[model samples]
Target: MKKVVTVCPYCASGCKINLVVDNGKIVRAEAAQGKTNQGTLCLKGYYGWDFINDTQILTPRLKTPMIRRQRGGKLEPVSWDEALNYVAERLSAIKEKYGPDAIQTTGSSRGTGNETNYVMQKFARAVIGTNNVDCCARVXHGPSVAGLHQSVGNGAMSNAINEIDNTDLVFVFGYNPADSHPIVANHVINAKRNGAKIIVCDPRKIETARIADMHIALKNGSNIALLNAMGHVIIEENLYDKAFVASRTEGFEEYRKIVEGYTPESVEDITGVSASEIRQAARMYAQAKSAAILWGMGVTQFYQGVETVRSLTSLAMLTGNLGKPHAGVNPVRGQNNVQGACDMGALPDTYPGYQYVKDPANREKFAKAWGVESLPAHTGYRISELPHRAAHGEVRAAYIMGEDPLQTDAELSAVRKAFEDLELVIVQDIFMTKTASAADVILPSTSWGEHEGVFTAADRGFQRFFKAVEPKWDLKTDWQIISEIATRMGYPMHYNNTQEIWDELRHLCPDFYGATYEKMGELGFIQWPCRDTSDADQGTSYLFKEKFDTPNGLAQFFTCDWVAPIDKLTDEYPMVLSTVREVGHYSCRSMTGNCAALAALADEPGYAQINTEDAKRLGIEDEALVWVHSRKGKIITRAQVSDRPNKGAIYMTYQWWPEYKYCAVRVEPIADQRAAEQYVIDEYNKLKTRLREAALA
Candidate 1:
């Protein structure tokens, strides 16, 4: 059997898999023995291997320069020399014409840690001379990062999947791991079987919710209310850990006062859950010996997303659920390397290891290491700001790697226009995604199975993988392609292979300082903070065992007041529309759409799941094509009448393509302060413009 190495590219689990290949074809895929996954495979991990050799894989068409003549035009291939030179020349010209701040870059969360570390940020800092770099986190978990950092010490998931087994209760907030994290869901189910109480809080009755002992179908955008109510109940019933609070936390007095105002009756008015049910859920969670809070995009996709996470952290801290074995706050990442990408400094404001880039000491150290004059001391624009910046001609060039924003963005038509308006657009991916179709240059890159690199899972376990197969046709690994371009542009980023890059990264990050390729190869996988050589073998399971990483080595609790979403129920849009993801599809259709089986599972573009009562009132039947209009746009989709959604609420998945015109409505913002003014403007100017244009046509 020929040896092949790979890692799961689905969710942030990053389980390493060893593929047995024969004559260039994968015969079998077995979990890398002794790894953290223990040879366990999820549904997607087991069957999703077919995407590597899918017919949709793009191959060596060009390394040269080409431009789109019109919006939605085909990408014409060119040569490597021409493309690199063209980008370098244009970028230099743009820097000369406008300030260095005029140019911006957006990295991908889907790629490996080494790829993101060596390529995307390096391109922005060394070549483009701008620190304005961000990724999908701005849309996915930007708020969670901000909110958690404000409350807790770090932005990473506090507990590992294994911690669930040791917990007496689990508070699953806004996450449906049954579809998103299949194997982890099985663990949760197993935990329930072993006598752990499960509580689910979400707008829809998801698969995970159906299995929960207590399911609270809270109103969309009202997560803060539910959490605050729980906090109030915990405090009122004296279920809080007083010793843990007095010794291990700060700002508790202020937070407790704020939560006191959110009583069960008040929360019931906002969340639509009964006061008695809220009290029961809170008492169960607070009384549990050990409890964990698991959250997802449902809590982070809004403008006030950070505040929601902050409240979640506050609730967990009040019950003394952190810094322990089975008790901590967790944010389930959407992509495999998303946590690693952020840890590797893919964010706009932070360096690797979540170090603040604006701090002079941090900047000085990095500047000394990279041989640069001075690193940018200010934060850059987030990904959500890209479309607006591109539309206003502030951001001229965008390089997207392994992400398709056209189909995945909240507003599809507006995102398309922004892509069209960019002067230079470069897409580096395994295939020509919808976003790449409008690019100035398309760089064919290797898929997960075809490349060797290291990635960190959501659980904070660092794992490595070796190249499983040769590149399909002429595609190069992402690092190789980016290194080639960087070299052509006069930056000598010479390294023999990916290992050298990993070595450099470990040196920069203290958490990975003790980790080496050889050690990882022998020991399977290791969690971070392995500071001591003796402790290297014992990977860190829980951080802040004694103290946190804050100013005083204590976690801070924020006093977050309740805020509502920007949009509310009106005559035109009478129901709250919540966007979610199904297990059969990934973030966008680019990666998972090519799989015939997964596609067959979710064949349609979009479907609204409405309650039976709401469907009857609206005169809509099951699987009936209904026009669902939001303030920003309107989409026609089949309605599935179900009890999953509450009365006057609707649920729809957000993984539809742009080509599906009928399923492309833009939902307005709910109670998000950052999105308030922008939501109004978009609804009035942008949405109106589209409607008028469509009418005229």
Candidate 2:
């Protein structure tokens, strides 16, 4: 038996673990002492490795390359030579016919490491000669990055994860730490035990609320209103840091004017929290010696997500909680490598290290380094725009990596239609996901435990994870697969290993220049802006300590008026449907769903948590199978009636499709419980059997 050290492939908490391998297979996982997780792990870290063994409990592991000759043809197994040639030919024809702008590519934000992401984007920009690239980060923290970059000049957290435990106060808004990231939750708990005041502003009474000094159960979709009201209170009572505002910040007067109208009393109806409670929370924050503001998808999943993020940044600036060791704005990432994906230039607007595509200097620098004459000068299309672009024939091809957008993206009906309309679809993944099942070409890639590379944690820390066991079937690493395709397309790309790719990208991105493989040896956690190779430089633990990353080198305050959710309640649909995370499963369930332990803990047709009164009024009992209908579509899920939820809202896991659209919904109790139960079981079995047979054949 042997042990291989690697970071958890589940969440961005970046818990290090050692895979116990026996006879060339990963038998178990043991937690390792790392910076973020101190020799502790969640259920996922302990049991999420069984999928790499190809158990195929919930879904099949993709082994062989596949290709579908026609739109309605079945995916047939093919040789790597044939698959690569077909993909290269189709993509080249699309570019020749419709220009490179018509081809869309994506990086992986799940288990595929930073080296794969760097190479994926390089292939798209240098080989395909387009800036049309993105990843799953577009669906989650895109707004956090967009808003923070414009306001604070940095999209990532300003402080380290360990610093959260020592802060004077912890302000949590629209995030459930215990469910999304338990390791980070421990820090919040530690902060409270150390006498730090905790203020939670969320519609749901999350686990953090239990120990909160004050839990403001604000109304759903009222994030901006509540945050603006808090800002109004801070400025109105003269609790703001006048010196910091005058010296370190800009746009204070314009920001002050925007929040002046959103008084605590005025927004009482919108926020549903008392005016006094709002004032008290603001006072606690502004009075604290230092405070950290943490948020999640709850703040960034709404239509006004970006604006709400700006307002949150304004709060930190108002109280002078930034540019310090234990205080700053934090948008804790969800996926394990989503932070790394963004950092590695998986976004459409920026290259690696957040360098703008529109900037001539950045483009020139990257082009010269990559041996290209020039790069795309215009910003590319976002993943959110793909459905519409494909439907309109603007986007003719898509090369997706490590994402199941068909099951995860909003408006599935339109997404399906767009997929059908596309000229070519290439999916590179380990599992036979919904997206992969519909692809014209499928490339099999090695799993996390089967490869070695670096991953950037949520707090900007870069750590190296090692390969554990050999792949049971024929499979290549993600970067190797991308390089082969790029070579076939005339780019002639090649790399000996992930470190060579890592070293190449590090030289191009100054922020990552000093984070050498030696610096991040084994369990070393080196954060970004590691610009020098000297031992005295230990990489940056926190950003903006000296000056912001903006063009002006100063923090800027950006705020706007709150807008009500587009999804409105009516007589037919009186409950608001909000998508949430599941503790047992990760994104799209491509990995966790295939693990026996995780699948046993949670299964198909997941639960919908509703308020007790809402369930009773709708004649729904706890654990009863209920039909949830929206204007767009409907699905059946078990009802979880609880007091923790606010009235007139139903929260379901993202395991189900559809984002927060005009997602006003109606829940109806099922009359035939036995039949409904049997239907779900039968469907899940059929899906499992079909996928299992497809991969085996």
Candidate 3:
């Protein structure tokens, strides 16, 4: 058997693996023991490759492109020339008639490599003449990108994964790395075994709580109150580093004023945890010599998502955690290439490397590079706003790649209608996904194993992957398809391979200039901010050794206040239902659903994780069928009776049943001091009322 080393496309942990090939197929796989995950392969990383050569399915991937003239017209398979020509014709017409903002595109996050992602965004800017391009990050970590960039000058993870070994304490907020990313969980678990303490702050008894020294289980959506109370404890007890706060941070006085009123006693009324627990956790975190703050979508997928992330960033700065070896702020990315996607400017408001598209300097730089007269100087719609905007004719055409919006986005029925309203819908993916079903044109793409490219990890590491298997002879790689449409549409992109795409991207992204294939081929992976090509240069793994990325090179603290969640519990809808990502499955289950080993562990039917106490009251058994509903739709699934969650909250994974069918209320921001305080009080009353009513039901 021949072995080929590559990075896992499961998540952003960037674990290297060896594909044991036999007769042009990956028969087995094992951890390559590279930099990130030293000799550890999760179930998904080992078995997820079955999608490329699943013997059960006749054709594992889409073999050809499909095009249709009308919505209900007969579908016909077309060659590359036919598909690209028709797409260019329609896109040109849309651009001419309604302007550049009328068209939008999304890059892939699952497996589309960094090279293709950079081209995808470039096609939107240089070819389509619009900055209205984005990725799944708009829904998953838009808050992390926007809020963290505002506070710390960069939005990526602050430290490398190896830093977990040197840190003494780990403070995990609302993130469950055990089920979410097993590789990351190993870091904390190993830390605990090495005599370090772990503290978990979440609404449920997540797997990490099993090994935690303290499990501060608060109510769902009460993260703001709990975090604010912790900040108050640090300030009132004088636990903050005064010198660091004064020199390295700004807005200390304003932040202190906002948190002054968040006393432990008052915050206890908002969150379920007592005042003492919040104080103890704050003291433990502040007194530690070196500690790391890790968070996930639990803090970012709310109406106050951006503010919540901002609050977390401020906590790190308060304790002088930045610019150190073992201490930094970390947001564990969920997708394999989302960090790369954002870095490549797959966003509405920025060019490559997060350069603002509205900035004249950036526009002039890119215009000169691409030979364009003028670029769009205004910001465009976000992913969440596009569906609604298209409904009103603000956006008329969409080019969606890799993501299945109708199946994985919010407001399931509404997203379906939004895509249907678009004049032209083009989907590029390896499978006939739910979103592809609604597209007028579906371009076939290759999976990870069938391509060779680069993937940027959560901690700003650049790594390489080699093609272990071949795709269908007729299939095209993501970059090939993208360039074909761009050139035929009058934008000449001269590229023969992924290397050419990367070289052009580096001109726009300075941090990635030193990252080349030859360098990465020698060393398994290299951390970014790699200034130049030097063998001694391993690339700066730990950022901010001297100064920050801002103007004065200092981190800025934001005044984050406790805000109410968008979702509320009414008499009719009393339970707080939140979603998750399962260890056995991933988004849309496009690959995991086809794997025999994975399917045996996780079936198609989703589950509602109801508390044991609530299950007994409703007479719902462990696998009993029950109707789990929201304002949008009702789904009948098994009730997973467990003590994992609180009394009034239930959980489900977004990998099954319906991903986007959920009800979340909408609320405006209350800026006034007294008004914001009263809003939290009203929300507390509503929560208590719902919990009390549900207790007796």
Candidate 4:
């Protein structure tokens, strides 16, 4: 048996693991001593490897390239040459007729690593001649990148993962690390052991909230209200750092005026949290020697996501938490390579290293490096807007890689209709997903265990994950697939290995110039801003030690008046629906759903967690199948009667559905329980059988 070292592919905790391989088959996984995770791992890391063996439990692994000669026709197996040639010709026809702006592309934030993302964006810019390139980050952490860049001049976490436990206080807002990232949750446990004060602000009583010094169960969509009120308390009580606010920051007076009206007593109705409790939490957070503010999708999946993120950054700056060890603003990313995908320039507005695409000098440098006359200067379409644009005939073709938008996007019915409106749909993935079923062309690609490349953790750290097993299908690496398509499209792209691609991108991106493959050997982890190649340089751990990344070298402050939820609540839909994470399963359930242990632990038709009083009022019982109706659509899920949630709100895991964040919904009890249960079983069986047949064909 041989041991293959790799990082967990589930979440951004970046827990290192050693896969015990026997004859090129991964038998089991053992925890490895890594810099971030130490010697611990979450459940996903321990039992998530069997899916690489093609368990065929939930969905079968895609082994061959398949295509539909015509729209709404059966998918037929085809050779790589036939698939690539057909794709190139169709894409060219669309580009020639509708222009380069008509086509859109995306990079994978899942199993595909940083090298593949870099190649994908390059293919879009140099080959397709459009800047229509983005990734899943558009829906998850897009606001974080946009807001933090405007404030502190950087988009990622300002502090390292290793510093979370050493902080004097940890202020968690809208994020539950226990279910999102268990390895990171363990760091919170250690911080508690070290006598650090913990403050959690969420609607539900999350795992961390149980141990919190003060847990403020704020109302849904009240993030800005609670945050501005905290700012009001900090400024009015003079708890803010005057020296740091004056010297290291700017725009304090305007920001102060914006929060002046949001006193704790004034916004008591807006935020269910008590005025006295809010004041106490704010004082505790501001008085700490060092503090860290961490948030997740609960903070970003709103209409005011960008504004709320800016408010979070402002709070950190006001408390003098912009720089120094064990303290900063942290938006803990969900996917393993979401941070990496953004760093590799998979966004619409910026190139690798956050260089703006509208900048002539940056565009000229990249165009010269890639042997092109020019690059796209205008910002491209985002993934969230692609469906609407396609429906309107603005986006004619979509080349989706490693994303299942049909199952994960906000509105399923709308997404399905938009795919039908597109002239062409290309899905490049490892398994047959709901989005793959709608694709005009399906390109099979290698999984994480079959590819060796670099992945950036939630923080700016870059580490290498080795190939653990040989892929069992006629599949190619993601970069190889993109390069082949680009070559057929009149642009020659060839790389001997991922290292070739990595070395090429590092030279173009100054922040990643020193993150060489050799330096990131088996166990090495290097953070970004590693411009120097010396051994002494292990890259940056915390940003803004002296000067900010902005042109003026000062952190900005921003605050705005709170807005009501986008989806209005009425008598018909009285309860608020908030989507959350599943501790066992991952995004869209394409990988973890195929694993035996995880699938058995949690199966089809996930639960809807509601307050006991609300569940009783609706005549719903625990573990009973119920119908949840929203304005856009409806889904049947089991009822979980719990006291965690506040009244007038229900929580559902976002794995088996969509419209996740905060929508007006109503849950009703099913009259015929036996029939409803049987119907769900039949639907599950039908979906599994169809996906299996698709893979085999």
Best by lDDT: 4
Q: Tens digits of per-residue lDDT for model 3 on 207-318? A: 9998888998987777778878888998999999899998888988888998999999998877888899989999998888988988885567753566777787788889
**lDDT (0 to 1) per candidate:** 0.70, 0.86, 0.77, 0.88
Which residue pairs come into collision in candidate 1? Answer: 63-79, 63-80, 64-78, 64-79, 564-671, 565-670, 565-671, 566-670, 566-671
Which clashing pairs does model 2 show? Answer: 567-662
* Per-model TM-score on C-alpha atoms: 0.88, 0.97, 0.91, 0.97
Per-prediction RMSD in angstroms? 7.1, 1.8, 9.3, 1.8
TM-score of 2: 0.97
Candidate 1 stretches with Cα past 4 Å from truth are 28-36, 57-74, 138-145, 532-538, 617-619, 658-697
CA lDDT, candidate 2, residue 123: 89
Error of 4 at 302 (Å): 3.4
Model 3 scores what on Cα lDDT? 0.77
What is candidate 1's lDDT per residue for 1-697, written digit by digit as tens?
6866667787876666777788887766777653446677765666666667753421112222345434455445556666667666777788788866777776666744554554567667666667777777532233324667656667777778777876899889988888777667776887888889999987677888877989998877777778888989988889999998899888888888988999999888788899999999999998999999888855776445677788888888888899988889888777887777776676787777666777899888877777678778777767667789899988887777766777567667887888778887777766555566557677667777777777777777777777777755666667776676667666666567778877776776777777677766733566776554454354688767887766688888875777777665666567776666677777655556565555556535356777888877767777655666765566655577898777777777766641111121323322343354344445435433432332222
How far is 197's C-alpha from truth in model 1 (Å)? 1.1
Residue 696's lDDT in candidate 1: 23
Model 2, 1-697: lDDT tens digits are: 9989999999999999989999998989999988999899988888888899887777788899999887887899999999999999989999999999899999988888999999989988999888889986642333324578787878888888889999999999888889999999998999988989999987788889999999999888888888888999999899999999988899999989988999999999998999999999999989999999998855766757877888899999888888888899998878888889888998887889888788899999999998999899877777768888998888999999998888887666766887898988899999987788888899999999999999988898999999999888889999999999999999989999999999998898988888899999888899998988776678888888878877788788978898888777899988888877767777677678778898789856788888999888889999889999986588999988899878978888757422362268899999999999998888887877777766666
Cα displacement (angstroms), candidate 4, residue 630, comes to 2.6
